[PDB]
Design an enzyme around this catalytic site. Structure first.
Site, mmCIF file in Angstrom:
data_model
loop_
_atom_site.group_PDB
_atom_site.id
_atom_site.type_symbol
_atom_site.label_atom_id
_atom_site.label_comp_id
_atom_site.label_asym_id
_atom_site.label_seq_id
_atom_site.Cartn_x
_atom_site.Cartn_y
_atom_site.Cartn_z
ATOM 1 N N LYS A 1 94.013 -14.071 40.738
ATOM 2 C CA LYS A 1 93.295 -15.264 41.204
ATOM 3 C C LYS A 1 94.247 -16.215 41.915
ATOM 4 C CE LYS A 1 89.397 -14.362 38.862
ATOM 5 N NZ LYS A 1 89.863 -13.182 38.058
ATOM 6 N N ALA B 1 95.934 -18.938 43.706
ATOM 7 C CA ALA B 1 95.345 -20.199 44.118
ATOM 8 C C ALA B 1 96.340 -21.336 44.247
ATOM 9 C CB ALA B 1 94.259 -20.573 43.112
ATOM 10 N N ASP B 2 97.398 -21.099 45.011
ATOM 11 C CA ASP B 2 98.420 -22.112 45.176
ATOM 12 C C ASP B 2 98.568 -22.480 46.650
ATOM 13 O OD1 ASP B 2 100.876 -23.685 44.596
ATOM 14 O OD2 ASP B 2 100.844 -22.524 42.727
ATOM 15 N N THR C 1 103.968 -20.890 47.832
ATOM 16 C CA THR C 1 103.994 -20.271 46.522
ATOM 17 C C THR C 1 103.152 -19.002 46.555
ATOM 18 O OG1 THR C 1 104.330 -22.399 45.382
ATOM 19 C CG2 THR C 1 103.323 -20.622 44.103
ATOM 20 N N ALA D 1 79.441 -7.109 29.515
ATOM 21 C CA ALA D 1 79.644 -8.285 28.680
ATOM 22 C C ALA D 1 79.011 -9.569 29.235
ATOM 23 C CB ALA D 1 81.147 -8.492 28.442
HETATM 24 O O1 LIG Z 1 98.668 -29.516 45.073
HETATM 25 C C1 LIG Z 1 99.677 -28.939 44.742
HETATM 26 C C2 LIG Z 1 100.806 -28.652 45.576
HETATM 27 N N1 LIG Z 1 101.861 -28.033 45.100
HETATM 28 N N2 LIG Z 1 101.939 -27.628 43.793
HETATM 29 C C3 LIG Z 1 103.130 -26.970 43.281
HETATM 30 O O2 LIG Z 1 104.134 -27.925 43.084
HETATM 31 C C4 LIG Z 1 105.394 -27.433 43.567
HETATM 32 C C5 LIG Z 1 105.756 -28.217 44.810
HETATM 33 O O3 LIG Z 1 106.955 -27.640 45.368
HETATM 34 P P1 LIG Z 1 107.712 -28.206 46.650
HETATM 35 O O4 LIG Z 1 108.424 -29.570 46.174
HETATM 36 O O5 LIG Z 1 108.843 -27.219 46.939
HETATM 37 O O6 LIG Z 1 106.855 -28.359 47.904
HETATM 38 C C6 LIG Z 1 105.238 -25.931 43.677
HETATM 39 O O7 LIG Z 1 105.512 -25.225 42.452
HETATM 40 C C7 LIG Z 1 103.749 -25.812 44.035
HETATM 41 O O8 LIG Z 1 103.169 -24.536 43.678
HETATM 42 C C8 LIG Z 1 100.875 -27.856 42.881
HETATM 43 O O9 LIG Z 1 100.942 -27.504 41.719
HETATM 44 N N3 LIG Z 1 99.791 -28.509 43.419
HETATM 45 O O1 LIG Z 2 83.831 -13.834 38.961
HETATM 46 C C1 LIG Z 2 84.560 -13.160 38.239
HETATM 47 C C2 LIG Z 2 84.317 -12.777 36.877
HETATM 48 N N1 LIG Z 2 85.186 -12.031 36.207
HETATM 49 N N2 LIG Z 2 86.366 -11.585 36.780
HETATM 50 C C3 LIG Z 2 87.286 -10.751 36.032
HETATM 51 O O2 LIG Z 2 86.796 -9.446 35.894
HETATM 52 C C4 LIG Z 2 86.943 -8.983 34.549
HETATM 53 C C5 LIG Z 2 85.564 -8.929 33.925
HETATM 54 O O3 LIG Z 2 85.722 -8.516 32.569
HETATM 55 P P1 LIG Z 2 84.486 -8.276 31.588
HETATM 56 O O4 LIG Z 2 83.787 -6.915 32.074
HETATM 57 O O5 LIG Z 2 85.077 -7.956 30.267
HETATM 58 O O6 LIG Z 2 83.559 -9.446 31.430
HETATM 59 C C6 LIG Z 2 87.987 -9.889 33.921
HETATM 60 O O7 LIG Z 2 89.340 -9.471 34.165
HETATM 61 C C7 LIG Z 2 87.679 -11.207 34.636
HETATM 62 O O8 LIG Z 2 88.753 -12.159 34.635
HETATM 63 C C8 LIG Z 2 86.699 -11.916 38.116
HETATM 64 O O9 LIG Z 2 87.746 -11.525 38.631
HETATM 65 N N3 LIG Z 2 85.770 -12.688 38.771
#
Ligand SMILES: O=c1cnn([C@@H]2O[C@H](COP(=O)(O)O)[C@@H](O)[C@H]2O)c(=O)[nH]1
Ligand SMILES: O=c1cnn([C@@H]2O[C@H](COP(=O)(O)O)[C@@H](O)[C@H]2O)c(=O)[nH]1
Lengths: 212, 237
Positions: A62, A64-65, A69, A174
């Site tokens: 997932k 999401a950064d 990163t 599930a």
């Molecule tokens: O909205 C944001 C933006 N950045 N970061 C994280 O904060 C750090 C920022 O690093 P930087 O000072 O080198 O840009 C990195 O670990 C980055 O994944 C977050 O968690 N959220």
């Molecule tokens: O929208 C979704 C829902 N689930 N999952 C992932 O798919 C698997 C579903 O597992 P389950 O059959 O045991 O519920 C898990 O690894 C879960 O994090 C996703 O990636 N996206």
């Protein structure tokens, strides 16, 4: 065509994870490994699954950064041996692009998560899902993830991405999704708990293969 | 929590030796280190316990947790068992996903930081539009720690308005991303700095310089006094 069943291996200890995956080796050729297992046993578990089972591995991280990163995460994940990685589209185009660039360089695949299957997904993700899928199309994404729990949403996503894009769908078993209905729109279904929690995982996998 | 010098090091180097060296060079200036997947996926979760053993610093796991409730619970359990004091969770996946994290943190006595708006350009596409609602969802769920963008200080003040002054707010984007530390610290309790410190020819000098800039803002160390200060800063904003 391809095997339509993907195992989500979310057990958290090596022995159980390897034992259960071994039991269903005959029924699945792709295993989705996520953070529950990786954070519990390490990234080396990816290489071990490939050696023991000869399966393809989707890293369900997932992602999401921010772009910088995301690039690092993808690089470490593909070096660890994963064939593909699941990336969130909600953080935007630049973040998805950073993942695609690494995947293109290493000959690996990015799967874009458009709408999640849990109830909470209706709060923010669902309203952005169509735009995220369109963003995916504009970026050249060819692999997508959509919800087994909402077949009408899966149908809409399929309309947006087209018949040539590959769509996999979790939430089967599930979470309440139905294998048959899901496969009317998705190319493959993801099944975790319904198989791995079972006393007899092989029988559970066999049963799903049977109904489809 | 109280962050020494209002500066959190984002340790995103990807090899153990460099990560331990740089952190050791700046430990006299900070007491809070944020460890994310670039380091963990390269060196393993054991790296968190090693940092705690070596430095005694507070450790925030920047894992951007963003899965379904069931998986979120697993990630938080594994992360807290590994030694993290806190974990950063996304709010875009909804309330049940955040609640799953909060329940584990409550049970284990750790903390959850809710990421409301990210600091990169892409955040404008979908996140910014959901940010105020995510912050309110956090308040309704009992969340007490938040993350907001130093690159958009006006968005930070609005966030501060929603979460109140008793909530803890940290903010990344200072340095490499171009964020304004001065305006940011009118609203956030602490800033996060990664590259500007860990890619510096002299990380200790880089950290020292940032802290000098922070000290120049004359922000009270006492929580009660900075609360008053923050209330006035927000009213002005
Ligand atoms: O909205 C944001 C933006 N950045 N970061 C994280 O904060 C750090 C920022 O690093 P930087 O000072 O080198 O840009 C990195 O670990 C980055 O994944 C977050 O968690 N959220
Ligand atoms: O929208 C979704 C829902 N689930 N999952 C992932 O798919 C698997 C579903 O597992 P389950 O059959 O045991 O519920 C898990 O690894 C879960 O994090 C996703 O990636 N996206």
């Amino acid at each position: 065509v391809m095997n339509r069943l993907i195992l989500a291996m979310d057990l958290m200890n090596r022995d159980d994870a390897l034992r259960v995956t071994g039991e269903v080796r005959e029924y699945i050729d792709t295993v989705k490994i996520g953070y529950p297992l990786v954070l519990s046993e390490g990234m080396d578990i990816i290489a071990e699954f490939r050696k023991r089972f000869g399966c393809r591995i989707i890293a369900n991280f997932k992602v999401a950064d921010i772009p910088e990163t995301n690039e690092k995460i993808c690089r470490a994940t593909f070096k660890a041996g994963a064939d593909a990685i699941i990336v969130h589209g909600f953080p935007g185009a630049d973040s998805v692009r950073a993942c695609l660039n690494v995947a293109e360089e290493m000959g690996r695949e990015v799967f874009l998560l458009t709408e999640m299957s849990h109830p909470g997904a209706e709060m923010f993700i669902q309203g952005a899902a169509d735009e995220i899928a369109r963003m995916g199309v504009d970026l050249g994404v060819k692999n997508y993830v959509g919800p087994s729990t909402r077949p009408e949403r899966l149908s809409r996503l399929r309309e947006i991405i087209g018949q040539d894009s590959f769509l996999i769908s979790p939430g089967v078993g599930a979470q309440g999704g139905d294998p048959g209905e899901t496969l009317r729109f998705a190319d493959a279904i993801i099944v975790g708990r319904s198989i791995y929690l079972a006393d007899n995982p092989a029988a559970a996998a066999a049963g799903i293969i049977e109904s489809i």
